[PDB]
Design a binder for this molecule. Structure first.
Ligand code: K
Ligand code: K
Ligand code: K
Lengths: 534, 530, 533, 167, 35
């Protein structure tokens, strides 16, 4: 009639039954003395260098409470809706004995966001010297207005370590700098408990923390404008992109999905007409194809001829010594700012082999195209010679972005007047004193064996996750990701509610690229994103 | 201590023994009786065709599970506690089947997968003597709820084992009748008595956007009753279409009444550009229809139809028996109106008008999806000579001279918009819908279909009530028919309505819409259209 | 196999079980009174005015005991059929210091109807001076020969506010429009309780109380003959209408629902007629379309031409806006009082645009038409060119009414022999010194941009509520309301069992038109209805 | 221990019945001494006591009402809001009147940014009257509001100085 | 004795057990912590 979740008549094994001598034998063979072992030891979290160069009031460590501190809780957290309780954060330091310098610890409450200033020491703080032998624990209490926390919650009690007195070596000169690195470990804490086991296949109604926006390695970073791998960051006062740029509301001012695949269209040039207007066949927005590139041409011009470049004085360039030896290029080519796009170019009765294309958003008046940076059903230009003679043909065509004919131009995405939008161009400036960044790719060129830079508002993994998954972030905060190169030079990127990325320094410089990215936490946008460049 | 001086200027003496006499004439015994019994809430037919994993009942905890709480909830803005729910299956003893109840927590939204059964669930058989009671506990992080709260504990009930009838045939669609009754738990309490007339500052609940009967569903483009639905990949409309923000990209109020204008023309001009005298958006007449003409036109003459072969339709045999229809009249794709016309000294009876949004060049109109005060085109005689004639004209829309067109609202280019076109595609595995209607034609006694992004009750309520809904959510509406086929509509924050199934099909049209709460837009809306 | 209303197999809530510590947590979080917070305070119910005009002994207020004296009880009354017990009252005056006068409150027992005399002050009464600031509280007991009441019962204990000393102000001996708003607030007595849950949807045998027939704001008032907004009132010795007029028995002597919609018909004529007879396609009475106009033309006429107007015996056309300043019109049209209706003349082979309609009810002798005082399926006249030849043409029409033709006439509803019925025209004269009223609005003419007045027997909300809902009112009584304008002018309307609204004054005068209405109570139709105009 | 001047609002003859002259939500901004010490904290909880009066004349009538609406609700300019407990105050009344604004919260503490708290409104119960100035219509009745902390009031969670608030 | 007439025109009931709940969510323990 009714049967509970643990109810039913047992018969057991029919040939044998469970034994305890064999389960005991596995505890003998193993070291199983208790379940949930992660509650019994401290697990590595991170480690910070404390050098003599660092004056007082600088923050070295800053984490808010939560289950993303310990990996063994980050795993079980996937099964539960809620959590509550305290974490224990052990600290270890191994000074030289002859060193001097004290280091402070502050458990700031929820609702605040620290600052690098000695005013933070006008507050309860524990100190510990470089000559500290044993580790210190610093349990972070769960101070909460609610009765339980969710997993999307981030306004929690935090702990910061900050320089109370500068580190001192009596032997070291004023020039040479020394240091002692401080290691940080975490343990679940005794009052920590997860809550409200969720059934699998369940949307969580607020999502989780933005911890999976940037991959942990640079091999998986590709731009949202061109499919190639990132190679460097670019700081500019204004950053803007529409097509594959997505915000935390799962909405976009663009026309394409976060994936690169060919562009199928149909084009119905009538008379001898090497150029025409193509119509969408695959689309998310009516009229515009998915994957159509978001950049216009510089000028009005008639595509009719061949390539042409010069070295500022009419001297044409036909060799690498001329191109690299040049300072600027004129680029008198008649099909300047377009994309080559191989173009299978099928039709009924067109037995001739296909010919490459050249595409942009632009108008058309009977021979030419004008730069129109507002894409529509009528701003889909093609120039590929679909062997038409005085008869409507209606060819089908599939196109795959390969290169960019705009030789000599600046990096793509550097001019808003040339960047394409539908109605609204997302754009930012310097929030706080933190400068935006483009992500830099490169794209192939026409007949030169060099390439040209390409700017990107996002990494494609960042766009993909923001199209599918739902995240909370107010418009005043950032989701922070600490970048660390191979030498150890690091800096923090902060992603916006708008989807744009920032950095807390005017110039990054050069750096080893087999680098990584780790989520540190949510951070208010005023506060300068930390960095250590060297 | 409350203000006022009591004064015994009476011979009153309210006796307490008379209240006991009334408790004797009426077996009162409890101040709130509804807490002492289970009350009918809904019923679902559990059939032999519904397979495992299909949800029969799903409702989140709240006052809307019981009418007596739904009635007293109007006096409060907070509640807390559990509600009991009772089930009585009422089938034969030859039947064999089994259901499973799942109480999911406050912070997830369930689905119709068997992954809900990887979680504590209680089983109960079709062949039950005594009904079964489930208490939905109020698990919460807060200390009380508001009426606008929807992330609460839910009860899900699905088919664990399909229902069996050994005597089943193709002609025997028998099954069980699962009635849901509710009672408020002993811990249920209302809190925070509200001032009457006061609205929650963050929003009320979308419990009243679709009326409970199809007898009074009418469209936001034409005043005629809905007949059935239409699924399309892109749905869009501006006029009379309101979002969940009391905002609109249109120009007319969520109602239908005549359109007053004035037209000043001369030299026997049968064309004109009217100017509004009843507007909400400056320039447009507050009711002007939101569709243009297909082509440039020089409206001169009379109706004209063929059938691809120069024939002519003068009977109800060619129209219905035509391959296609070719409208060769110089006024096609515009709206027929009553057009009472008044002008001082015009000793002539009013002539009907033909209105549409379009430009004018001295005898002819061209389509323009944009609208301003320069597009308000008419075609009426007006009996004008050489000089200007102010011609106070009042219009009442009745028909449409676009005989052969497919449907109104199908061509995005013909649809009118001031600057912005509200538009949605699919969100999840859920398709957007138009609500289909019908409008009459000019020369033929047949009609043409009309598409509507909203029912008019949905528009006017959103016009003047601030509801609560996240962008990533719907306000779900279970819609049954006279037979038993049902499906859920989901209204988006943009005011557009979606559906989960790809085709609706035939429906017995005395329909009724219920409210099934909030549902994440990334989840397939239910359907049992078969 | 038998199960009771509180019976079943309790399984629990699988993942958790209801906690009392959380329910106790929510009580402290919110405060708490004992399960009915409305029993603990006085709530605003109504406010009444007291000017210097009101002489000594006049009654400004009478409302009987009941659950309508408090909004929270009017809400929970819907869940019950019986009640019993007292209501506490607090009343005050927002007077000035310069104002004198004094006012009295008298709880009269059941049965008695009061009289506007100071002899009623020979009975215990709560004096309240205009100069008094602190309010005063007193109870209204439930004095009943029965053991419970029903929601329809109006023979209960009752309160009246009566002028004890006239209000005085030495200043305004020129305007005489002084104030002293008099508020009444209510709280349930401890002996108050409801009895007898009703099943939801179930109707009450003794009916409900007529407290929702007129809206509380004039923006919602429209006529039962024409859809425009009411603008003022009219008093006449006789008041009559049939079409959308509903009594308290959900009965109308007319032929149309309380709605305004297009009128679908089907003409059929031949040889060149222009003057056919339609047939109904949407109706409630067989033969007559739903929404057909309830007025007949003045005389016999042969519609053939166009408009024609002229002034007092002068043969001077009113071509310009010199229409005004004429005061008499001949109206020489051959269509002279029809209703203008935009048409959609759909037919097979017409191939010409539709034309206006010019409808009315009348007897088609020939091309001419004779006034039919009575409606029938053989009276439904329509004068439009549907472009007929020799062969029959059976067009579909679908009219919608826009205006009127009878230029220079009295308001539609003045003449009776032109107002249409089926057999019996409802009619009411004066009923105990109280005079009946029409509700006046406007309708557009066809030729001149001006409009003409229209008389209505009801507001459409009064017709919709009487078409659907079931109310109680004895024939010798009114459901009395109080109309108050933006100024301090007010008068009580009384809606009888026949559906007609009466008034105690002979002339209302002009009134700032954002009006409001409040249900006072049931009165006898004999005692004159209160006023201050 | 005392009520402190916070603000004053005007009430003329123009303001018709049911109009709202005042709405301020509970918080430490209702008293200057709490707005001072709020800078040293990030959270708070508890009630505020209020005293309000009208510097009216004897020739003036009218009456005014005070309504502590709960959290969540936004009020409406209607006399239906007076179907809820409310403190009547006549213009002719001299002695002030005192009442509390409780902290009714679904949480366990507030933050300084929180504005969904219990709230007070001053609402016109009866229109103000003056038989004199039917030409200027510029009468007075300043309506002062004074505040004192409730005994259940207390601040929580010292913030470090210089640190910013997330909310 | 301070001026003013207190009046309980409220459903208020400020609970003292909620101030202790706040001293539990926050380890308050002292009115002036800086000392
Ligand atoms: K080819
Ligand atoms: K005319
Ligand atoms: K026709």
């Amino acid at each position: 009639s009714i049967t509970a979740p643990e109810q039913g008549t047992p018969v057991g094994g029919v040939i044998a039954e469970p034994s305890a001598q064999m389960s005991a034998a596995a505890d003998m063979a193993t070291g199983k003395s208790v379940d949930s072992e992660w509650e019994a030891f401290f697990s590595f979290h991170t480690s910070v260098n404390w050098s003599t160069s660092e004056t007082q009031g600088k923050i070295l460590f800053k984490q808010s409470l939560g289950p993303l501190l310990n990996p063994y809780l980050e795993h079980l957290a996937k099964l539960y809706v809620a959590w509550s309780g305290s974490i224990d954060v052990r600290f270890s330091i191994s000074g030289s004995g002859v060193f001097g310098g004290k280091l402070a610890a502050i458990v700031v409450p929820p609702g605040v966001d620290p600052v690098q200033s000695t005013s933070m020491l006008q507050y309860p703080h524990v100190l510990f010297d470089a000559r500290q032998v044993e580790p210190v624990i610093f349990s972070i209490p769960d101070l909460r207005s609610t009765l339980y926390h969710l997993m999307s919650d981030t306004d929690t009690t935090s702990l910061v370590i900050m320089v109370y007195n500068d580190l001192i070596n009596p032997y070291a000169n004023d020039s040479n700098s020394s240091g002692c690195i401080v290691t940080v470990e975490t343990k679940p804490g005794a009052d920590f408990k997860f809550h409200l086991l969720k059934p699998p296949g369940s949307m969580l109604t607020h999502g989780s923390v933005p911890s999976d926006l940037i991959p942990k390695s640079s091999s998986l970073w590709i731009g949202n404008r061109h499919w190639t791998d990132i190679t460097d960051f670019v700081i500019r006062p204004f950053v803007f992109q529409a097509n594959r740029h997505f915000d935390f509301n799962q909405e976009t001012a663009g026309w394409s999905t976060p994936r690169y695949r060919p562009i199928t269209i149909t084009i119905s040039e009538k008379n001898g007409a090497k150029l025409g207007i193509g119509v969408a066949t695959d689309y998310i927005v009516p009229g515009i194809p998915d994957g159509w590139p978001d950049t216009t041409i510089p000028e009005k011009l008639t595509p009719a001829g061949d390539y042409a470049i010069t070295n500022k004085s009419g001297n044409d360039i036909t060799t690498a010594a001329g191109y690299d030896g040049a300072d600027v290029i004129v680029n008198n080519t008649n099909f300047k700012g377009m994309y080559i796009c191989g173009s299978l170019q099928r039709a009924w009765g067109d037995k001739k082999i296909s010919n490459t294309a050249f595409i942009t958003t632009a108008t058309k008046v009977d021979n030419a195209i004008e730069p129109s940076n507002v894409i529509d059903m009528t701003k889909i230009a093609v120039y590929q010679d679909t062997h038409v003679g005085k008869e409507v043909q209606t060819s089908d065509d599939t196109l795959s972005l390969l290169g960019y004919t705009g030789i000599g131009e600046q990096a793509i995405g550097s001019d808003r007047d040339r960047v394409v939008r539908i109605s609204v161009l997302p754009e930012t400036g310097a929030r706080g004193g933190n400068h935006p960044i483009f992500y830099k790719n490169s794209i192939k060129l026409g007949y030169v064996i060099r390439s040209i830079d390409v700017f990107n508002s996002q990494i494609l993994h960042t766009s993909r996750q923001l199209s599918l998954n739902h995240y909370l972030l107010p418009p005043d905060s950032f989701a922070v990701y600490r970048i660390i190169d191979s030498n150890g030079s690091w800096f923090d990127i902060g992603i916006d509610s708008d989807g744009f990325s920032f950095v807390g320094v005017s110039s990054i410089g050069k750096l080893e690229f087999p680098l990584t990215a780790s989520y540190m936490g949510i951070q208010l946008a005023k506060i300068r994103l930390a960095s250590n460049i060297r």
